[PDB]
């Protein structure tokens, strides 16, 4: 389902739907337009993870747990420079909220059924 997550977020960023960042995630959750969110772990985050988890669990949003931050930055793909191989400077990211209008994808359907079941 990770490949489904990466494809749906790529479609969301193509369609200018998702938001990236703690401030952006809070804005989406408060605007009640959020659909999914991602969070990293095993980091020096004493109350960061607790704060975002409570925000995610407030009302009807899906949660995805990941380990690394720079890996999540690779998941979203913000530094696709030097296309002939590895990106030259990988950026890190912790919280990304996925709001999508172009949800017509089998990846979106599979991940939605996975969260529903």
């Amino acid at each position: 389902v990770n490949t489904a997550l990466q494809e749906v977020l790529k479609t969301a960023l193509i369609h200018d739907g998702l938001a990236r960042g703690i401030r952006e995630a809070a804005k989406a959750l408060d605007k009640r337009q959020a659909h999914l969110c991602v969070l990293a772990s095993n980091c020096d985050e004493p109350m960061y993870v607790k704060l975002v988890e409570a925000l995610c669990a407030e009302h009807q949003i899906n949660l995805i747990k990941v380990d690394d931050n720079k890996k999540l930055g690779e998941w979203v793909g913000l530094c696709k420079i030097d296309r002939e191989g590895k990106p030259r400077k990988v950026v890190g990211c912790s919280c990304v909220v996925v709001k999508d209008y172009g949800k017509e994808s089998q990846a979106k359907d599979v991940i939605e059924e996975y969260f529903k079941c």
Partner: protein, 68 residues
């Protein structure tokens, strides 16, 4: 050309580490409590919080001031 009054240095706006985390409060359960107020304006309806100064609250997007 020479000057007498020293040049007025530019305003260096300081950075805040994890400024988002200062808006809510941490709890072990799945509940949310908001510390500071939120602007009830039209453009910023329910997502943009307001400032918490020492004597009044303020929102710069619509220039809304709430004095005590």
């Amino acid at each position: 050309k020479s000057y007498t009054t020293p040049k007025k240095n530019k305003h260096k706006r300081k950075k805040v580490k994890l400024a988002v985390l200062k808006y809510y409060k941490v709890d072990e359960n799945g509940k949310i409590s908001r510390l500071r107020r939120e602007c009830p304006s039209d453009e910023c309806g329910a997502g943009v919080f307001m400032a918490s100064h020492f004597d009044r609250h303020y929102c710069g997007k619509c220039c809304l001031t709430y004095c005590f």
